[PDB]
Amino acid sequence: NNFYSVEIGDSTFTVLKRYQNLKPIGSGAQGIVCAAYDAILERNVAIKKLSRPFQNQTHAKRAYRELVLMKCVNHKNIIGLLNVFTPQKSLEEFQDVYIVMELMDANLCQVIQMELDHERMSYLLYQMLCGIKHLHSAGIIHRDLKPSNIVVKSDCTLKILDFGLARTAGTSFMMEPEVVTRYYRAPEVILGMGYKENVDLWSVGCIMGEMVCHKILFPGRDYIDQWNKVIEQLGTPCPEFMKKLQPTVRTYVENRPKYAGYSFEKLFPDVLFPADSEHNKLKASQARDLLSKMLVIDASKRISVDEALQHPYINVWYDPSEAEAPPPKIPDKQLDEREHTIEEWKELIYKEVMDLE
Amino acid sequence: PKRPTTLNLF
Numbered sequence: 001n002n003f004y005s006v007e008i009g010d011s012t013f014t015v016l017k018r019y020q021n022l023k024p025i026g027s028g029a030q031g032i033v034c035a036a037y038d039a040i041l042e043r044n045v046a047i048k049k050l051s052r053p054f055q056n057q058t059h060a061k062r063a064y065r066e067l068v069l070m071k072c073v074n075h076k077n078i079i080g081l082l083n084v085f086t087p088q089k090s091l092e093e094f095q096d097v098y099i100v101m102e103l104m105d106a107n108l109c110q111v112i113q114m115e116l117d118h119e120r121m122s123y124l125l126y127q128m129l130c131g132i133k134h135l136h137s138a139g140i141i142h143r144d145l146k147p148s149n150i151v152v153k154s155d156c157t158l159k160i161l162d163f164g165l166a167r168t169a170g171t172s173f174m175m176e177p178e179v180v181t182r183y184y185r186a187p188e189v190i191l192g193m194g195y196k197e198n199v200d201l202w203s204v205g206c207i208m209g210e211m212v213c214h215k216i217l218f219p220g221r222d223y224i225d226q227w228n229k230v231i232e233q234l235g236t237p238c239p240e241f242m243k244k245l246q247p248t249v250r251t252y253v254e255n256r257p258k259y260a261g262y263s264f265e266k267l268f269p270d271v272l273f274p275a276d277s278e279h280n281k282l283k284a285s286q287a288r289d290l291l292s293k294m295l296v297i298d299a300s301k302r303i304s305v306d307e308a309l310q311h312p313y314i315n316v317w318y319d320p321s322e323a324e325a326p327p328p329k330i331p332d333k334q335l336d337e338r339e340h341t342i343e344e345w346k347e348l349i350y351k352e353v354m355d356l357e
Numbered sequence: 358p359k360r361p362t363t364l365n366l367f
């Protein structure tokens with residue numbers, strides 16, 4: 001009726017006329033995303049179509065979560081909403097959902113590949129860092145931070161992204177978490193342990209090392225080598241840790257060949273660091289000591305968000321209004337240990353769009 | 358000290 005068909009790649013876009021001139025910027029882990037102009041508002045905004053949402057109990061749970069989370073999280077570093085709509089009219093008609101949100105200038109995969117300075121890099125770390133702290137401040141782990149999901153503005157801002165997974169620690173592992181990027185998968189994930197708010201930091205760890213090394217920290221050629229690669233770098237884990245890992249995994253992870261591990265003083269020389277020479281608190285050895293406490297195998301000994309923000313490298317940008325920020329409160333409907341039908345996610349998801357406009 | 362507000366993304 002009042003929407004229009006935008007021939008984009010494969011599935012065609014049927015967005016409001018508000019959004020015109022659609023170009024592709026990426027394809028997240030749900031549908032696809034474009035950087036169109038929203039005349040009505042005056043500024044380029046990202047429209048995300050989740051073509052056929054409720055295919056199954058998966059792309060329908062990651063959605064209801066994405067929806068609610070989107071409308072609940074507000075923060076200077078955690079991307080915000082803007083508009084959500086469905087080109088379909090009737091209750092049955094529904095089969096697609098478009099999401100309009102902010103739109104930076106690039107994605108971290110652009111900085112990673114450039115020579116920052118200190119004050120700066122430390123700001124983004126802080127930046128990105130806070131957003132994280134906030135999201136957690138509601139018992140919400142993201143579980144997927146990685147350049148492909150981090151966005152920085154030319155004015156040097158920065159925002160987290162994709163709340164398609166970011167759930168709460170209510171359930172444990174799964175021998176099918178292969179969805180969360182390898183190079184940024186944390187030990188408790190890999191080893192199918194059981195995550196907590198911390199996991200997110202590890203991601204942030206494999207990040208910095210990337211903002212420093214330029215190469216990705218722990219490659220991996222399969223989810224099973226990932227481990228054989230992370231530990232080849234950080235040494236074989238302390239026996240107590242072993243006692244933690246599930247029965248089976250323990251055996252295998254134990255059989256692995258023993259690795260010395262390298263001190264971060266060599267894992268990140270004084271050279272791979274931004275001109276170590278300004279404003280005390282900063283200093284290369286601090287950018288590192290930071291890592292020194294994030295890149296940690298045993299989940300229970302990893303510098304949590306707070307202490308990170310509360311850390312010599314980060315800290316210099318602290319400020320209660322954007323860190324100890326008000327907790328992004330949740331209603332009382334969200335279900336992390338509960339599933340339904342597709343004709344139910346529909347009613348639920350459809351009844352989760354409508355009102356919105 | 359105050360944070361920066363640039364970032365040459367080219």
Ligand SMILES: CCOc1nc(NC(=O)Cc2cc(OC)c(Br)cc2OC)cc(N)c1C#N
Pocket residue numbers: 024025026027028033035046048079101102103104105106107148149151161162
């Ligand atoms: C890739 C993840 O998708 C998303 N990406 C963004 N990204 C951005 O705004 C930064 C950005 C700006 C660009 O110049 C116009 C191009 Br070109 C690509 C790009 O980075 C991709 C914002 C989102 N809200 C979502 C979503 N959803």
